Design a protein around this ligand. Structure first.
Ligand SMILES: CC(=O)NCCc1c[nH]c2ccc(O)cc12
Ligand SMILES: CC(=O)NCCc1c[nH]c2ccc(O)cc12
Ligand SMILES: *[C@@H]1O[C@H](CO)[C@@H](O)[C@H](O)[C@H]1NC(C)=O
Length: 345
């Protein structure tokens, strides 16, 4: 089990001003550190956040967090469940800022809620340095759903923070699961407007190179993987279902020719956005399932599982071009959900 630590800097808070925190299981014989960002949508104005506070309060407050959590999937310490990184130091960072991990705003007399996701990540990193992270060789910042987009928004800032604090030897990398969305035409009649409003409400921050491309008022563009990814310097592995259920939901899809063409075009567009992403795993499945699930080993693309592809990615980032039998770019080409037989049932 991973044990809860509330942040010692109690000014770095969840939405309601309670301290943020992290769950940690140390592995003293390992210099690998996995920091996982939880997902769970977001809220973008007072009324929308008030509703979330009533029925999704664990995503807005630490007051009711349990003392422990079990690590599952890529956070499992069992080699049978986690062939990739079972011996790593494991960190689960609860999502309690409702800001896609982008916020840097405290509660005040003008702000009913604090949106501090970007500061929570930096404070977790800072406090972990005293608990053994100072000796790391690899810090993998991973995350699912809103946490996957959170990886894209924060991985280079973690890399910058460690460099400025005096740790140039820690290799910071990202693993973005289920956070790679398209600002596409909806099937029926938006997220882009909700994100636009959210960024202003949260004082949301995006990576500097992406911000400089899109400029003031247009920071929402950097929440879309295919736009922010080319601006990132840290190595990032992208995991994305071609027919992601959150994508389809915001596209108002829940089969006649118009919908068939819509779904096929979505898969093709997703495939296209990954063509120049050398470390990626994109199965042709309709799913909301994420990499902290216990059976994450089961899905394969071209006969290669995700734990294998991640291992191949580790090999590709050794100090010493492609590896025989150890691929890292795995994108399905078949055009309909479950045309891959290994898709989750
Ligand atoms: C699902 C969706 O609306 N995607 C478009 C907006 C968007 C970009 N990044 C995100 C991360 C989490 C999330 O809940 C929505 C988004
Ligand atoms: C996921 C999502 O938000 N899609 C909508 C993006 C969007 C906003 N305005 C639009 C106008 C034309 C279009 O082709 C797409 C959009
Ligand atoms: C706590 O965090 C805030 C926000 O990052 C920062 O301004 C402040 O200096 C921190 N306090 C201490 C004692 O480090």
């Amino acid at each position: 089990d991973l044990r809860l630590h509330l942040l010692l800097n109690t000014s770095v808070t969840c939405n309601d001003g309670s301290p943020a925190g992290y769950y940690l299981k140390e592995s003293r014989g390992s210099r690998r550190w996995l920091l996982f960002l939880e997902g769970g949508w977001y809220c973008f104005n007072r009324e929308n956040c008030d509703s979330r506070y009533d029925t999704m309060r664990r995503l807005m407050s630490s007051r009711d967090w349990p003392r422990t959590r079990t690590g599952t999937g890529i956070l499992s310490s069992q080699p049978e469940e986690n062939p990739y990184w079972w011996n790593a130091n494991m960190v689960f960072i609860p999502y309690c800022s409702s800001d896609v991990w982008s916020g840097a705003s405290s509660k005040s007399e003008k702000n009913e809620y604090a949106f501090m996701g970007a500061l929570i990540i930096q404070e977790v990193v800072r406090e972990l340095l005293g608990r053994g992270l100072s000796g790391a060789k690899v810090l993998l910042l991973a995350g699912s759903s809103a946490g996957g987009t959170g990886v894209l928004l924060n991985v280079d800032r973690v890399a910058e923070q460690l460099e400025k604090l005096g740790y140039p030897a820690i290799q910071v990398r990202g693993l973005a699961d289920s956070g790679w969305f398209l600002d596409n035409k909806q099937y029926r009649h938006a997220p882009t407007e909700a994100i636009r409003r959210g960024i202003r409400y949260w004082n949301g921050v995006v990576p500097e190179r992406c911000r400089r491309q899109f400029q003031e008022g247009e920071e929402w563009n950097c929440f879309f993987g295919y736009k922010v990814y080319p601006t990132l310097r840290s190595p990032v592995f992208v995991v994305q279902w071609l027919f992601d259920e959150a994508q389809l939901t915001v596209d108002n899809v829940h089969v006649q020719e118009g919908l068939r063409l819509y779904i096929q075009n979505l898969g093709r567009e997703l495939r296209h956005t990954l063509k120049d992403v050398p470390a990626s795993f994109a199965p042709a499945c309709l799913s909301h399932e994420i990499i902290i699930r216990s059976h994450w080993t089961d899905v394969q693309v071209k006969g290669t599982s995700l734990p294998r592809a991640l291992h191949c990615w580790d090999r590709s980032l050794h100090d010493s071009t492609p590896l025989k039998g150890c691929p890292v770019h795995l994108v399905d080409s078949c055009p309909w959900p479950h045309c891959n037989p290994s898709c989750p049932t």
